[PDB]
Amino acid sequence: HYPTDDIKIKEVKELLPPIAHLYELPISKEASGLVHRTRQEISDLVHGRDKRLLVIIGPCSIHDPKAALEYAERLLKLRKQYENELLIVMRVYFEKPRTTVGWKGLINDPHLDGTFDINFGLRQARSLLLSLNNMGMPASTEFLDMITPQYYADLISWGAIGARTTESQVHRELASGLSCPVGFKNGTDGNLKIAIDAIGAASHSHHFLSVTKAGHSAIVHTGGNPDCHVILRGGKEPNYDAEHVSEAAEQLRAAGVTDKLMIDCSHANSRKDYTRQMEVAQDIAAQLEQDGGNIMGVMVESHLVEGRQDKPEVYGKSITDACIGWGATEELLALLAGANKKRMAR
Amino acid sequence: HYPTDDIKIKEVKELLPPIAHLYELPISKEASGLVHRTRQEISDLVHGRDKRLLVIIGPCSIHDPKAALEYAERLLKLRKQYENELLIVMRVYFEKPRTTVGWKGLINDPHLDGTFDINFGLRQARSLLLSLNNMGMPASTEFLDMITPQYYADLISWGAIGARTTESQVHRELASGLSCPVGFKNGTDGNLKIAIDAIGAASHSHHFLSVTKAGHSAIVHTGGNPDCHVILRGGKEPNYDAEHVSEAAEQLRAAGVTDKLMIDCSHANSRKDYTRQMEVAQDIAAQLEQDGGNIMGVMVESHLVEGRQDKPEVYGKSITDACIGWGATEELLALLAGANKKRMAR
Amino acid sequence: HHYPTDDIKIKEVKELLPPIAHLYELPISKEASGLVHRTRQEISDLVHGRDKRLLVIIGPCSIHDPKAALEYAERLLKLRKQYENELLIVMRVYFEKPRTTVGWKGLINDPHLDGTFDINFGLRQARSLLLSLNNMGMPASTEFLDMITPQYYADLISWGAIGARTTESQVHRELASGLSCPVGFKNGTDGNLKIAIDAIGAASHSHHFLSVTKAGHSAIVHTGGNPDCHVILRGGKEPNYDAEHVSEAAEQLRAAGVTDKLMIDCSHANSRKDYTRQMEVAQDIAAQLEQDGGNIMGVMVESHLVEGRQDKPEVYGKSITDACIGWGATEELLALLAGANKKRMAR
Amino acid sequence: HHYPTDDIKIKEVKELLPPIAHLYELPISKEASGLVHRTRQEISDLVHGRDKRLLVIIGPCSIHDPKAALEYAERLLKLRKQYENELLIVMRVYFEKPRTTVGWKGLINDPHLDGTFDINFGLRQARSLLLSLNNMGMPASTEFLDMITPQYYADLISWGAIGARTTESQVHRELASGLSCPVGFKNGTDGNLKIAIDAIGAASHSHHFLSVTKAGHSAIVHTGGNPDCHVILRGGKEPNYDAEHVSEAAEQLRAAGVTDKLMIDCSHANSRKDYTRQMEVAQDIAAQLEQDGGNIMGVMVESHLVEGRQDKPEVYGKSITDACIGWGATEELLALLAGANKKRMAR
Ligand SMILES: N[C@@H](Cc1ccccc1)C(=O)O
Ligand SMILES: N[C@@H](Cc1ccccc1)C(=O)O
Ligand SMILES: N[C@@H](Cc1ccccc1)C(=O)O
Ligand SMILES: N[C@@H](Cc1ccccc1)C(=O)O
Ligand SMILES: [Mn+2]
Ligand SMILES: [Mn+2]
Ligand SMILES: [Mn+2]
Ligand SMILES: [Mn+2]
């Protein structure tokens, strides 16, 4: 009997089931309310019913929860201060997808040493998310797979599907069952169609494989997600300007889906240069003054300290994509609250 | 206390675990032998040790087990006949991924009526694969998610990551732990880099969430898949000709990965015209007579009967992409067997 | 270094298929469901004296070959039908006899009878046999030795037993309080009746115990209580099958405020482990039913195609556990009891 | 359409958190590991007659409050250290007393003592208490009532009991054969010693039984056998603690080829269910140790902070199960046995 099973597997180990984590860290009355309301409020932006600017803002990836709570602390004050112009939600991404060897995120490797203590990772991520909501900061994250959401999705008010997974059918099937509103990024080369197609798909009922709260293999039957939109993320060339928005809106209308879209100031719209994020936010501001009726949100990569670092030596600086610092963050948010005050007035 | 969990979920049903299917349909000694051996043979083609041509050929999708076994019976005679020039492996794909509402495949919806009997479908899928292996026909399939492989991967001699998932990180991580060699397709608009990257990634050790054979949520630690390669499936224009092969081989060598690749005669290389698959095969034959040192394989969409139909009314005719019938399949294989005979002699 | 404390004396823990995998392959049929439900109700009536038919739990000491069990059942079925107005005949389908010494652990635990413990196959086989029997019109009884096996096949059982060695165990009483069938509790191995009377009282209440869900995962079970429990007199230091022992036991049952209808085991210690004495016990019981026998709702008999026992399974339809009477004796015994009980019912 | 046959008498089946969830929150510590491993070994030495110290299993009849139990442990720890050359002291940590009538089902099953049966909390609390006791330097003993709970906290147990009710049970003996700790089998509730002598023989061999994995999945468990099993004299219709009974037990044990080293329970049927008689029993044991007492390797005592019992848990450190002796009496009893066994050990 020749072996044919698990030939290239080093190990398969049981994780604690989602219920174990839900038992230790149940969502509280206050978190529940924040999440439920924030999702509704985002739905309204998505469907053109309110004209505030959704701002998804925070670290490229979280590596230290201490600093993330500190960042949240400062961000909350601005969330309240711009609450009439801006709906600020924190970026709480645990991993950046990548091609080469490197750190696989807080869930996967919370100790940043390669011991992959995933049970700790998932506990830590739920805990941070619960603390954020408990202090009054709503959270957003990208879902990279079909299982992790069972651990902490109940605490997420806005989810993302990245450029690298927007065309994947099973990620669309996931999105169709996510309790939060979902943004689909255009593709790494600037293809927008894949994202538009994703919205259509994610709005219908689907089936996909996952585990139950008790941790057992299962088939999930979704009811459809009416709250999806596209995110302009750039490509071979940037796609943030009025000519690119207008054309995106036109494609969206022609597909019978929402022509309210979000713009990412980072990644390929900055040319992977964090200093250009402000240029992009400036261009967005300028659009919100002239007209910009098709814009419902913006994405921004921001931390306490500006820049990137290969090891986590320095407190509050990304080890993934380069972020703008806190001062640049005060300026950008102010700029956007100012421009949008004027759009809302009209 | 507002609800936040599963707001958009109709139902989550626990499935029968893999061990339940494996108890009913354990892999036999002969099947095990064939799988182990066919994987090794394909590995030799990927790495240039052997100059026979891998032919992945079969229906676009399986919607009937019976026709599939009869197809396999005919293919098997051609497999044995051409065994010195070709390595013939049957296409056993249970689902074509699609953007529009339609049939979701044999595993998902075995009764083809929207009843979604997944326990039945997974059983029926493993039974078919076991039966093919037992009669001597190795099998190939596309893995769309991270759970289904635990059901029948042990029976698969070659695996595909499709164009819509080649850039997905989790699917690359899956590939890194599959027991079979894996072909990655270029992107839907022709990007070849995502597949070149995918190879590099998938040769390394990774971690992904999945279930154990007993159906429990698990973390999977992989050892890397050294047998991965690219599949040219076309883009905005087809990419099968010698100039496209040579550019691809150069790019592959520059990434330090295998410069032996596979060409898909169907899909965007035929531009969804089944009658142009033969043309592609002819061009491939010409390249093999002249040089074709960078070609290790071909993909072809073939069925008993040519064409396609919306409902499964006609026996042995595709309900997904249009395929060439049996007569054309005989000419195509004779063509390729002869051309590669000359290449091998050289 | 850091010292081990877990599973020190364990060679292996293997996962079993869950009950649901077996239920998937062998779902209960309309006809089996009907027979089980009706038979449980019909036995209930005997426990509470609504009906004076005699329950006869009868069959092999243990099931070691299914073909033989099926053949046995085909013969028994003709007699079940023939005596249906006087007797309610349910087949014994026990898969293990508990023992103190090393030996065969039964068809569930070791179906291949070679020491491989192919428990997944054994459970599958036990379910298949029980389904087949119910499909042919023969209801089935069994003993439950643990708190997990029942999830595999209880749905196919019309009457269940808790043995002499477990009747006093609290968890087995908790089990019984949640079993869907009526349940017979045996007196202790030395003849204690108290432990069985106490178990009826206990099992009539709601309890909790640990078991697994149909999907196979650790669980707490909250029961409703089993109002259909009774005692079984099985001998001990002295036999307890006679009129005087029956009278003393019924007195004790009324004193505890539980059903004074009881079962009598003709085999085991009441027969002094001699299969030929099963007949003399039944004779005594027939005599009781003729005179009065108002406190008797059933009997238990160890019977097979072939009389005797054997150490290896060389002969077809001869037990490899306790020794059984043969088919001829079985025909006799049932005719005896059917005639004796016909008169009692006429009263 | 079908007649229902499944779970007719079941209120609910609730999935439990699996053992791995408890083991993550409360993993065993290096110190606790060392204490459990060593104490297990030490008790093995007493079972096989290599050390003449007396094993004392002492504590509350049941635990219904962990704060009182931790305070009890702290006081006991001081005598454990004081008498360490004469006595090997281990705390009795039983979470439940099996009973026939309606009553409280213990700390694991009903931690809030109100019938809300929050078993997840109960199991969590049980393991937390055991981990705290081992961490402070006090080893723990318990009774295993079923085949699932050991997966939750057995790794923290230095000595185990199978009580009078379950000693004859096949599955409980099978469980014993795989417990990482030494195991004491109590004689039967009417004085039968044979079932416990048998239990030893059986438990020393390899067995199979059904349980769950640490992941909570239905499993078959293959044991390697438990060579450290012994009997416990707990009385019967009449008490069984005196010289004559100990001698008769010992001859019986030698005759079966099993350890003739035994434990005497001062409480239960040996006190006549009267906590003031535990002291009489201990005095008698002590007289045996001064004379000869070569077959005794331990004793069992039900002791709490406060003496006696209560129906509702109104009073701190006082049993709601069996009546216990108080702390003062406990100090007398331990000084007594230490002094008697010091004389034996010197001989
Ligand atoms: N629990 C997720 C949905 C989900 C269910 C099952 C599997 C994966 C995701 C939510 O509420 O959004
Ligand atoms: N069982 C798969 C690998 C795998 C393991 C676990 C999860 C997913 C996939 C194989 O043998 O190829
Ligand atoms: N299913 C059993 C009851 C049961 C449930 C759960 C565990 C054990 C037993 C019956 O119908 O009789
Ligand atoms: N884990 C227990 C033994 C055991 C294993 C499995 C089930 C039940 C008990 C011990 O170490 O003692
Ligand atoms: Mn980033
Ligand atoms: Mn196709
Ligand atoms: Mn018998
Ligand atoms: Mn007690």
State the nearest Cα–Cα gap between A127 and chain B, in angstroms: 16
All domains of chain B in start order, with CATH = 1-346 (3.20.20.70)
Ligand nearest to the CA of B208: 2
Atom of ligand 1 nearest to the CA of A177: 3
* A40, A282 Cβ separation under 8 angstroms: no
Ligand nearest to the CA of B151: 2
Chains contacting A (3 or more CB pairs within 8 Å): B, C, D
Could you give the CA distance from residue D121 to residue D22 in angstroms, rounded to a whole number?
Answer: 10
Reported structure resolution in angstroms:
2.2
CA closest to D2 among chain C residues:
C30
Determine, for residues C14 and D154 on separate chains, whether the beta-carbon distance falls below 8 Å: no
* A338, A285 Cβ separation under 8 angstroms: yes
Could you give the CA distance from residue A63 to residue A316 in angstroms, rounded to a whole number?
Answer: 9
DSSP letter at A70 equals H
User: Does C211 sit in the ligand 3 pocket, CB within 6 Å?
Assistant: yes
Cα of B243 vs centre of ligand 6, distance in Å, is 25
Spatial strand order in the sheet of B9-14: A207-211, A217-222, B9-14
Token pair for residue D58?
A: 């002492």
User: Does C131 sit in the ligand 3 pocket, CB within 6 Å?
Assistant: no
- For the CA atoms of C252, C255, C257, C258, the dihedral, rounded to the nearest 10 degrees, stands at 10
| Facing A8 at nearest CB: one of B12, B36, B224 | B224
Ligand nearest to the CA of B222: 2
Q: Which residues contact B292 (CB under 8 A, 6 or more apart)?
A: B245, B284, B343
Token pair for residue D218?
A: 């239905």
User: Does A318 sit in the ligand 1 pocket, CB within 6 Å?
Assistant: no
Chain D residues lying within 8 Å of C154, measured CB to CB: 6
User: Which candidate, C106, C148, C107, places its Cα nearest to that of C16?
Assistant: C148
Experimental determination approach used: X-ray
| Facing A16 at nearest CB: one of D15, D24, D120 | D24
Residue D223 host element (H or E): strand D218-223
User: Does B11 sit in the ligand 1 pocket, CB within 6 Å?
Assistant: no
Chain D residues lying within 8 Å of C6, measured CB to CB: 28, 154-155, 180
Token pair for residue B330?
A: 């005989």
Backbone φ, ψ for residue B137 (5° rounding) = -100, 110
Could you give the CA distance from residue C199 to residue B282 in angstroms, rounded to a whole number?
Answer: 83
State the nearest Cα–Cα gap between A11 and chain C, in angstroms: 17
Q: Where are the beta strands (DSSP E) in A175-257?
A: 182-185, 207-211, 217-222, 228-232
Q: Is D20 on the interface with A (CB under 8 A)?
A: yes
* A144, A166 Cβ separation under 8 angstroms: no
* A104, A95 Cβ separation under 8 angstroms: yes
Three-state DSSP string of D105-160: CCCCCCCCCCCCCCHHHHHHHHHHHHHHHHHHCCCEEEECCCCCCHHHHHHHCCEE
Phi-psi region of B75 (alpha: psi -120 to 50; beta: other; left: phi over 0): alpha
Ion ligand 6 nearby residues (CB, 5 A): B 60, 321
CA closest to C106 among chain D residues:
D208
Q: Give Dmax (Cα) for chain B.
A: 76
Chains contacting B (3 or more CB pairs within 8 Å): A, C, D
User: Which candidate, B170, B248, B172, places its Cα nearest to that of B209?
Assistant: B170
CA closest to B143 among chain A residues:
A170
State the nearest Cα–Cα gap between D127 and chain A, in angstroms: 16
Token pair for residue C217?
A: 């995962």
Burial group, residue C224, by CB count within 10 angstroms (0-12, 13-18, 19+)? middle
CA closest to A13 among chain D residues:
D215
Which 316-335 residues of chain D touch chain C by CB within 8 A? none
Ligand-binding annotation for A60, yes or no, is yes
Residue D161 host element (H or E): strand D159-162
State the nearest Cα–Cα gap between D6 and chain C, in angstroms: 5
| Facing B23 at nearest CB: one of C17, C20, C215 | C17
Token pair for residue A38?
A: 């924030």
Could you tell me where the DSSP H helices lie in chain B?
18-24, 29-46, 65-81, 118-135, 149-152, 169-175, 193-202, 242-254, 277-290, 326-345
User: Does D211 sit in the ligand 4 pocket, CB within 6 Å?
Assistant: yes
User: Does D140 sit in the ligand 4 pocket, CB within 6 Å?
Assistant: no
CB count within 10 Å of CB A271 equals: 12
Q: Where are the beta strands (DSSP E) in chain A?
A: 9-14, 53-58, 86-91, 139-142, 158-161, 182-185, 207-211, 217-222, 228-232, 261-264, 295-301
Could you give the CA distance from residue B91 to residue B329 in angstroms, rounded to a whole number?
Answer: 13
* C287, C276 Cβ separation under 8 angstroms: no
User: Does D160 sit in the ligand 4 pocket, CB within 6 Å?
Assistant: no
Determine, for residues A23 and D25 on separate chains, whether the beta-carbon distance falls below 8 Å: no
Q: What residues form DSSP beta bridges with D324?
A: D308
Could you give the CA distance from residue C171 to residue C167 in angstroms, rounded to a whole number?
Answer: 10
How far CA C145 is from CA of C150, C164, C171, C172, in Å, comes to 9, 11, 11, 8
C contact test, residue of A211, A212, A216 with most C CBs within 10 A:
A216
Could you give the CA distance from residue C300 to residue C305 in angstroms, rounded to a whole number?
Answer: 17
Within 13 Å of residue C9, how many CA atoms lie on the same side as its CB?
27
Which 255-314 residues of chain A touch chain B by CB within 8 A? none
* C141, C115 Cβ separation under 8 angstroms: no
Ligand-binding annotation for A321, yes or no, is yes
* B247, B237 Cβ separation under 8 angstroms: no
| Facing B211 at nearest CB: one of A5, A154, A211 | A211
Q: Give the rounded distance of the alpha carbon of D131 from its chain centre.
A: 17
Chains contacting D (3 or more CB pairs within 8 Å): A, B, C
| Facing A168 at nearest CB: one of B165, B194, B223 | B165
* C150, C179 Cβ separation under 8 angstroms: yes
CB count within 10 Å of CB A256 equals: 9
Cα of C83 vs centre of ligand 7, distance in Å, is 25
* Pairing state between β B139-142 and B158-161: parallel
CA closest to B213 among chain D residues:
D217
Atom of ligand 4 nearest to the CA of D160: 12
User: Does D12 sit in the ligand 3 pocket, CB within 6 Å?
Assistant: no
Helix axes A118-135, A29-46, angle to 10 degrees: 80
Cα of A305 vs centre of ligand 5, distance in Å, is 15
Task: Compute the residue count for chain A.
Answer: 346
* D102, C173 Cβ separation under 8 angstroms: no
* C106, C115 Cβ separation under 8 angstroms: no
Could you give the CA distance from residue B231 to residue A324 in angstroms, rounded to a whole number?
Answer: 40
Could you give the CA distance from residue B319 to residue B306 in angstroms, rounded to a whole number?
Answer: 11
Determine, for residues D18 and A23 on separate chains, whether the beta-carbon distance falls below 8 Å: no
Determine, for residues B23 and C20 on separate chains, whether the beta-carbon distance falls below 8 Å: no
Tell me which amino acid residue A27 is: I
Tell me which amino acid residue C311 is: D
Residues of D annotated in the binding site for Mn(2+), as ranges?
Answer: 61, 268, 302, 322
Determine, for residues A20 and D15 on separate chains, whether the beta-carbon distance falls below 8 Å: no
* Pairing state between β A217-222 and B9-14: antiparallel
Could you give the CA distance from residue A149 to residue A161 in angstroms, rounded to a whole number?
Answer: 13
Residue C78 host element (H or E): helix C66-82
Chain B residues lying within 8 Å of D215, measured CB to CB: 214, 216
End-to-end CA distance of chain C: 78
Chain B residues lying within 8 Å of A225, measured CB to CB: 8
User: Which candidate, D254, D120, B110, B293, places its Cα nearest to that of C210?
Assistant: D120
* D52, D341 Cβ separation under 8 angstroms: yes
Angle CA C169–C175–C180, to nearest 5: 145
